[PDB]
Design an enzyme around this catalytic site. Structure first.
Site, PDB file in Angstrom:
ATOM      1  CB  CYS A 268      57.192 -27.695 -10.858  1.00 14.83           C
ATOM      2  SG  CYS A 268      57.660 -27.001 -12.441  1.00 14.83           S
TER       3      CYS A 268
ATOM      4  CB  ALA B 192      62.015 -27.601 -12.782  1.00 13.64           C
TER       5      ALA B 192
ATOM      6  NE  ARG C 184      70.702 -28.732 -15.169  1.00 14.66           N
ATOM      7  CZ  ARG C 184      70.542 -29.797 -15.958  1.00 14.66           C
ATOM      8  NH1 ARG C 184      69.848 -29.697 -17.076  1.00 14.66           N
ATOM      9  NH2 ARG C 184      71.016 -30.988 -15.600  1.00 14.66           N
TER      10      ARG C 184
ATOM     11  CG  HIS D  62      65.057 -36.086 -11.432  1.00 13.36           C
ATOM     12  ND1 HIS D  62      65.580 -36.027 -10.158  1.00 13.36           N
ATOM     13  CD2 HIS D  62      65.286 -34.882 -11.998  1.00 13.36           C
ATOM     14  CE1 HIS D  62      66.109 -34.834  -9.965  1.00 13.36           C
ATOM     15  NE2 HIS D  62      65.946 -34.123 -11.067  1.00 13.36           N
TER      16      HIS D  62
HETATM   17  S1  CLF Z   1      54.086 -25.414 -11.562  1.00 16.07           S
HETATM   18 FE1  CLF Z   1      53.246 -25.270 -13.619  1.00 16.07          FE
HETATM   19  S2  CLF Z   1      54.485 -26.734 -14.783  1.00 16.07           S
HETATM   20 FE2  CLF Z   1      55.637 -26.097 -13.019  1.00 16.07          FE
HETATM   21  S3  CLF Z   1      56.795 -24.305 -13.623  1.00 16.07           S
HETATM   22 FE3  CLF Z   1      54.945 -23.669 -12.615  1.00 16.07          FE
HETATM   23  S4  CLF Z   1      54.019 -23.041 -14.461  1.00 16.07           S
HETATM   24 FE4  CLF Z   1      55.127 -24.653 -15.029  1.00 16.07          FE
HETATM   25 FE5  CLF Z   1      53.550 -21.124 -13.603  1.00 16.07          FE
HETATM   26  S5  CLF Z   1      55.009 -20.058 -14.915  1.00 16.07           S
HETATM   27 FE6  CLF Z   1      52.922 -19.570 -15.561  1.00 16.07          FE
HETATM   28  S6  CLF Z   1      51.616 -20.131 -13.868  1.00 16.07           S
HETATM   29 FE7  CLF Z   1      51.873 -21.989 -15.111  1.00 16.07          FE
HETATM   30  S7  CLF Z   1      52.354 -21.048 -17.128  1.00 16.07           S
HETATM   31 FE8  CLF Z   1      54.174 -21.803 -16.148  1.00 16.07          FE
END
Ligand code: CLF
Ligand SMILES: Nc1ncnc2c1ncn2[C@@H]1O[C@H](COP(=O)(O)OP(=O)(O)O)[C@@H](O)[C@H]1O
Ligand SMILES: Nc1ncnc2c1ncn2[C@@H]1O[C@H](COP(=O)(O)OP(=O)(O)O)[C@@H](O)[C@H]1O
Ligand code: SF4
Ligand SMILES: [Ca+2]
Ligand SMILES: [Mg+2]
Ligand SMILES: [Mg+2]
Lengths: 522, 476, 263, 269
Positions: free
Chosen positions: B58, B61, B92, B191
């Protein structure tokens, strides 16, 4: 520079003088780093009692949590079922993270999919992604069953899972008959354990709710076992082995052991084993349902007691000598089958190991953390060993649970210095090990850093971390261990006594200083 | 052959439903080194088809995980529920030097830890309380950043105001960053969100300050995250050549280094995808020129050292030659030991944005041939740069699904596969040696000359390890 | 050269009729202008465009099925006087957030390059009835630098104008959004102007102009054209001319002091 | 228990029409509760004799938590014994207004407002924009019967049609239906007829025609109902009939929304 004969990895390559000079230049030249004396003054400050109070005073900031979100719990449970693909409704980054967190702990592939909801999907809703996602996933991976869970973006926008899944079938994206159990799993509410509980009640509810008339309790003469969120293979294996040893018929609902442990024989298996759909449908016909980790299995307890009318026995997670005895006797009462000679011998051996290792284990102080059932089980066992658990922390725990644990500690003369903390993170724990020092820390890999901090204050102030728990990422194949039953107790006992002996050896290894106590026989 | 690869792509796509199949074919291409423009060949950076098991992360990340997290001095708060911060903690290896929890906070996980009260009511009051709390507990931090999780964009929380108000109150820089996971379609928009965030809240602070003394040789490494100490190995080479490295973005970085970056004469950009946004900006605002460089393998490093040195005077150019002279015997020793071991071995790579194209030279430096390569979230300009590097009729894939990847691998049959953690266990079971490209399989650094010895050694131990012979049981 | 203006008000009070007529005046003066309608009404681009309806970015992407798989030439069509006309469109009632479709559409235009096209002005007809996240979004992002509120002597108009002010105050820290003036659209009220200027003063901003209530407007609208276009000769044609020169001329943008119910 | 929701364009009399109608059911004697989701919250004002009613979001905001707040304080009974609560909402520019609407209804059910053998529950709602937060009473079966207030003008009809389109979409999951369209007089020349053809086009009946009178206006400054202040008057009598008709009307139908064009044909007459 590198000698080709002995190549150096990051460590100890950066330990080389050219690199050391370069880093210092970098630090002095552009970093604008605080003086080392200041850094030292501040570090000694965090080790203090004064800092612990400010640290424990926090109401809004969480540092280094000991809990994870719900869909992790949901994906793991979905993995327990045969030819079942976990499917998470919501954004994709979550799925990448669940697979990676699972991949590292199990060092095995983890299969999971997302419908990939976007910014645009946020305004409209999750309906298209769910139809296409269900259709694409089925065509591509051929899973017999797809179990839906949801990410927080989906929970906050409010997509209706039931409506979306029905419309997908109604519109013709996937067959009407294709199984699609779903559970809403808000990340803000609870933890991965609650996430696991929701997915399970949903799967159980989907298969057994419409047809209950035909079902009659005790008709199939097997006992349903619900594992809960479990990351040790030995545990699934041990529960089955003992029931098998006892001759008791059983159905393990949500068994992820074959898939998390498939052989490297040249062929990749996406799906292996699992709880059968029929096993799930025929479940209400069991004599009774036993829940291995009751603290996070509350919703499932309500569905099973209310809908299936099973009287779930109150039993603690089968850890330690007493709880294992209780689990076996209980199974004996439900099954009608006697506890075999073979199992009684095993208990004998556990006690023999306990009598044999009691002097080293006695009075040892431990600071430990984990999910509530496991922590609770460990605390009970340590007390059974006469060890002293000083700091007990469950991040995702509650008031009832804390009450249950204090009761356990009150029952033993051993739990005198013991204190249970809930809602407190590892940062809190770091402060605790510094102010009041445990001999050892029992926990997951996150504690590698607490240990590092203590050794920094000094050698004598260091608290070695003993790893039992989840996630464990810095050691290999520990997930193959067992914590349940006599076998689990034996493994835990050997790790603790040996952790203690290993440490004594390190402390007495100095030549003509402390080697007088560096004994051959211990 | 080209007809065979084309058939393979068509053959694989047959399993998918039509909307997905139609979309996917746009992402799979047989490479023509001749083509100037990527768009004729492949389409990229589009929303992923649901239920196909894409490897993409996402926006959180990309922003929290890759650009922001590595800065050592600052504290980054994952804002939202507990999970994002947890999965990504210490995941990482952006290596750094510091006293953790006291002056450096990279491995630490800082979170708002949203519960339902926060989701219904909103998180602003909490963020402000968290900022105050962060300050009393960790007094030496040099900055604070708020990385928005998915619920932040959705519940209507305004983190800019809190960041602006608190920052003003604490005379501390607080950077709100809107990397909500729903925004964008891959780790890529993050980014950009992160780069833009750095430019609005942290780049222009020493806009008017002229106290720092600057030599004409000053340079900043942009887009090297020091995985396994890659930046440090890269950094020592530039220093030996006579250039001074003011800043590293963002591995082992410090906020002071970043603020001092515009003062530098040239920006060397290692990762084009992640920080090209900031590089262009700097050239427009400060006039500082930026050049992409490659440090993987002796050939790219020599070619790179040479190009960077040309942009400078003869003393630097001369110094560049001494250094290439100095490490030449070291690298060739490595080639002599490991090339016979790895020669003619075919390699398949899947990674997100910079590496599929970049590590090709190193593999070729070892005599390995890269049969196919792809990208998790790369843009078409990335693909334009890729085809020249890739050989003819080699397979190229964008946002390859898991199913597509296994099928391509079964057909192609590469000796070794370089990819991430999710992809690795499936392949080893299959019996194909796997090296993780993202984490360098807990080894590295792979950058530079020093990095190349580790890399050759790593490909050789994994590719030739005795365990691969042992997979089929002797009893048939 | 470009400035961004948001026409905000309660529905049915003349935001659209006014935005189109004023844009026509700016067009007549020769300034290139683009109209983005964020109103679900979508009658935002009807006068300049001589269209019964403008297909929206949301309506179009649904048939195509994806954003950015949608061409700009198709999405935005130039009106009379060369003003680019576009409609955000919005979700089907009862599903998601309406205000969001507004966000998807503006971000669409920016990637596609509508802006930095050297347009002198940009006008967003935004519905001012409810200020909440989807609709206060142009406010959150600095989509509309200048906010001009059409308002009338009526109670909902004043409360709505006042609520939009509250929206502008909250995003004071985050951007450059400012309140330009208040445009009173006449309701044929007794002392409408003294009342709006009463409101304008209490809120910290001036009433930029008083629009006469007139018939030629009704007539130009059925004709599916703007008053400026239907009757350049007319007095009402002259008023919108006055309104436009005034928006180009006015140099005062202020963060508003939202008033109490009692004041 | 009967749950009806009043929907319409702002400024057209939904709060006023609903309070008086609720007061009539009160006079007739049915136990009633009024929940207002309009951000204004002047919804519970005529019945309550309260200048401004403290809302759930406003009240829970000081306390800091939901369900950490009492219903006695949150829900206060008005004239005729009708229970009054204001959903209220978020600060402008933040959040979803309709989201605040959902917590108040959720809060009322958990606490115990419903299954109180309250005969009528009336939800005052804003019909200008139809979004999931706003159309929240529609998504969950919060209000089974939906009544749309409207006028001679374009906005009421566009809103009535928009509200209907909303009801058509959530038709499959729930039992929500459109009972009829309540006319509010604009002193228009052919208001009743314009509404009837539209209603007829929509597939549902115009339940009542209400005259514009200063009795309503005079009564309002006094912050009390027309029904309360002037029971003996013609306007008071009109609101009683509306109440008698709503209790009486058995026809609930899924509206077929008409094209903006069809609305145009309806426009000239
Ligand atoms: S698309 Fe949303 S910003 Fe991105 S990595 Fe995913 S979470 Fe986070 Fe997830 S793991 Fe649980 S369901 Fe949320 S709280 Fe976090
Ligand atoms: N100054 C004015 N004089 C005459 N009619 C006007 C005037 N302003 C608006 N109108 C009319 O009133 C109606 C509503 O105008 P519109 O711009 O659509 O309002 P909104 O955009 O707030 O819904 C239209 O039929 C329009 O012709
Ligand atoms: N029959 C009527 N005669 C005169 N004014 C009326 C009548 N019905 C409603 N009103 C007006 O409506 C107002 C009350 O409702 P309002 O504030 O418009 O909210 P809503 O549109 O939600 O009902 C009063 O201020 C009054 O001017
Ligand atoms: S933010 Fe506004 S437009 Fe969006 S759902 Fe909420 S009330 Fe509707
Ligand atoms: Ca394995
Ligand atoms: Mg309009
Ligand atoms: Mg009202």
């Amino acid at each position: 520079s590198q000698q080709v004969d002995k190549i150096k990895a990051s460590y100890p390559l950066f330990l080389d003088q050219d690199y050391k000079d370069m880093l210092a230049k970098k630090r002095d030249g552009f970093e604008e780093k605080y003086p080392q004396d200041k850094i030292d003054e501040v570090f000694q400050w965090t080790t203090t009692k004064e800092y612990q109070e400010l640290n424990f005073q926090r109401e809004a900031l969480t540092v280094n949590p000991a809990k994870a979100c719900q869909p992790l719990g949901a994906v793991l449970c979905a993995l327990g079922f045969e030819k079942t693909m976990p499917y998470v409704h919501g954004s994709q980054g979550c799925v990448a993270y669940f697979r990676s967190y699972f991949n590292r702990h199990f060092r095995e592939p983890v299969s999971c999919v997302s419908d990939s909801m976007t910014e645009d999907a946020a305004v409209f809703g999750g309906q298209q992604n769910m139809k296409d996602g269900l259709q694409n996933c089925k065509a591509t991976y051929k899973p017999d069953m797809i179990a839906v869970s949801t990410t927080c973006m989906a929970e906050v926008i409010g997509d209706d899972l039931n409506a979306f899944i029905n419309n997908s079938k109604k519109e013709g994206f996937i067959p009407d008959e294709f199984p699609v159990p779903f559970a809403h799993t808000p990340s803000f509410v609870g933890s991965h354990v609650t996430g696991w509980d929701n997915m399970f009640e949903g799967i159980a509810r989907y298969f057994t709710l419409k047809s209950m008339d035909d079902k009659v309790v005790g008709s199939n003469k097997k006992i349903n076992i619900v594992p809960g969120f479990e990351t040790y293979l030995g545990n699934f294996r041990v529960i089955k082995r003992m029931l098998s040893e006892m001759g008791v018929g059983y159905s393990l609902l949500s068994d992820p052991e074959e898939v998390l442990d498939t052989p490297a024989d040249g062929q990749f298996r996406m799906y292996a084993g699992g709880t059968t759909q029929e096993e799930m449908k025929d479940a209400p016909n069991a004599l009774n349902t036993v829940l291995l980790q009751p603290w996070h299995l509350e919703k499932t307890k309500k569905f099973v007691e209310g809908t299936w009318k099973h009287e779930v026995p109150k039993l603690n997670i089968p850890m330690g000598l007493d709880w294992t005895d209780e689990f076996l006797m209980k199974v004996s009462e439900i099954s009608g089958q006697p506890i075999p000679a073979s199992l009684t011998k095993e208990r004998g051996r556990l006690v023999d190991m306990m009598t044999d290792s009691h002097t080293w284990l006695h009075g040892k102080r431990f600071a430990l953390w984990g999910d509530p059932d496991f922590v609770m089980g460990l605390v009970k066992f340590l007390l059974e060993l006469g060890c002293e658990p000083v700091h007990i922390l469950c991040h995702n725990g509650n008031k009832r649970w804390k009450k249950a644990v204090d009761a356990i500690l009150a029952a033993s003369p051993y739990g005198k210095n013991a204190t249970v903390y809930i809602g407190k993170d590892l940062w809190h724990l770091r402060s605790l090990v510094f102010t009041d020092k445990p001999d050892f820390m029992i926990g997951n890999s996150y504690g590698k850093f607490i240990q590092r901090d203590t050794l920094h204050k000094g050698k004598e102030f260091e608290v070695p971390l003993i790893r039992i728990g989840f996630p464990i990422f810095d050691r290999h194949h520990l997930h193959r261990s067992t914590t349940l039953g006599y076998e689990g107790a034996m493994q835990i006992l050997t790790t603790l006594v040996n952790s203690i002996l290993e440490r004594l050896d390190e402390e007495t290894r100095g030549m003509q200083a402390t080697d007088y106590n560096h004994d051959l026989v211990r | 052959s080209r007809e065979e690869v084309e058939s393979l792509i068509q053959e694989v796509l047959e399993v998918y439903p039509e909307k997905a199949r139609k979309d996917r074919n746009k992402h799979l291409a047989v490479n023509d080194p001749a083509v100037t423009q990527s768009k004729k060949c492949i389409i990229s950076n589009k929303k992923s088809q649901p239920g196909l098991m894409t490897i993409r992360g996402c926006a959180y990340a990309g922003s929290k995980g890759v650009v922001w997290g590595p800065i050592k001095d600052m504290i980054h708060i994952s804002h939202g529920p507990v999970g994002c911060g947890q999965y990504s903690r210490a995941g990482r290896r952006n290596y750094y030097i510091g006293t953790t929890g006291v002056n450096a906070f990279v491995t630490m996980n800082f979170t708002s830890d949203f519960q339902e009260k926060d989701i219904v009511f909103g998180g602003d009051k909490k963020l402000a309380k968290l900022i105050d709390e962060v300050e009393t507990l960790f007094p030496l931090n040099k900055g604070i950043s708020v990385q928005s999780e998915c619920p932040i964009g959705l519940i209507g929380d305004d983190i800019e105001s809190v960041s602006k108000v608190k920052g003003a109150e604490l005379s501390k820089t607080i950077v709100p960053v809107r990397c909500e996971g729903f925004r964008g379609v891959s780790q890529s928009l993050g980014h950009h969100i992160a780069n833009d965030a750095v430019r609005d809240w942290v780049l222009g602070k020493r806009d008017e300050d002229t106290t720092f003394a600057s030599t004409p040789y000053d340079v900043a490494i942009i887009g090297d995250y020091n995985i396994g100490g890659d930046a440090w190995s890269s950094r020592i080479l530039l220093e030996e050549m006579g250039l001074r490295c003011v800043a590293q973005w963002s591995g082992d970085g410090s906020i002071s280094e970043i603020e001092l970056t515009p003062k530098v004469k040239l920006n060397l950009v290692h990762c084009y995808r992640s920080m090209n946004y900031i590089s262009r900006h700097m050239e427009e605002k400060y006039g500082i020129p930026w050049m992409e460089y490659n440090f993987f393998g002796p050939t790219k490093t020599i070619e790179s050292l040479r190009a960077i040195a040309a942009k400078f005077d003869e003393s630097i150019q001369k110094k560049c030659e001494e250094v290439i002279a100095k490490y030449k015997p070291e690298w060739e020793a490595v080639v002599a030991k490991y090339r016979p071991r790895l020669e003619g071995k075919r390699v398949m790579l899947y990674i997100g944005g910079l590496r599929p194209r970049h590590v090709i030279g190193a593999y070729e430096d070892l005599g390995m041939e890269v049969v196919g390569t792809g990208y998790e979230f790369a843009h078409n300009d990335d693909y334009d740069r890729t085809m020249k590097e890739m050989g003819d009729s080699t397979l190229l894939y964008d946002d390859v699904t898991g199913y597509e990847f296994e099928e391509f691998v079964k057909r192609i049959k590469p000796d070794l596969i370089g990819s991430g953690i999710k992809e690795k266990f499936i392949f080893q079971k299959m019996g194909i040696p796997f090296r993780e490209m993202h984490s360098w399989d807990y080894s590295g650094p792979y950058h530079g000359f020093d990095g190349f010895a580790i890399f050759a050694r790593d490909m050789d131990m994994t590719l030739n390890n005795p365990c691969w012979k042992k997979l089929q049981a002797p009893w048939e | 050269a470009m400035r961004q203006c948001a026409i905000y008000g309660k529905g049915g009070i003349g935001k659209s009729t006014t935005t189109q007529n004023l844009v026509a005046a700016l067009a007549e003066m020769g300034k290139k202008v683009m109209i983005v309608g964020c109103d679900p009404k979508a009658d935002s681009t009807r006068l300049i465009l001589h269209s019964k309806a403008q297909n929206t970015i949301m309506e179009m992407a649904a048939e195509a099925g994806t954003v950015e798989d949608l061409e700009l030439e198709d999405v935005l069509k130039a009106g009379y006087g060369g003003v680019k006309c576009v409609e955000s469109g919005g979700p089907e009632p009862g599903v998601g957030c309406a205000g969001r479709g507004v966000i998807t559409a503006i971000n669409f235009l920016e990637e596609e390059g509508a802006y930095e096209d050297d347009l002198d002005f940009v006008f967003y007809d935004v519905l001012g009835d409810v200020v909440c996240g989807g609709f206060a979004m142009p406010i959150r992002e600095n989509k509309a630098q200048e906010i001009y509120i059409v308002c009338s002597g009526e109670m909902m108009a004043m409360y709505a104008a006042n609520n939009i002010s509250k929206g502008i105050v909250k995003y004071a820290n985050s951007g450059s959004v400012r309140l330009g003036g208040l445009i009173c659209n006449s309701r044929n009220t007794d002392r409408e102007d003294e009342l709006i200027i009463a409101l304008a003063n209490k809120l910290g901003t001036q009433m930029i102009h008083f629009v006469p209530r007139d018939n030629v407007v009704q007539r130009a609208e059925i004709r599916r054209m703007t008053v400026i276009e239907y009757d350049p000769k007319a007095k009402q044609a002259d008023e919108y001319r006055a309104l436009a020169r005034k928006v180009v001329d006015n140099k005062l943008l202020v963060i508003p002091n939202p008033i109490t119910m009692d004041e």
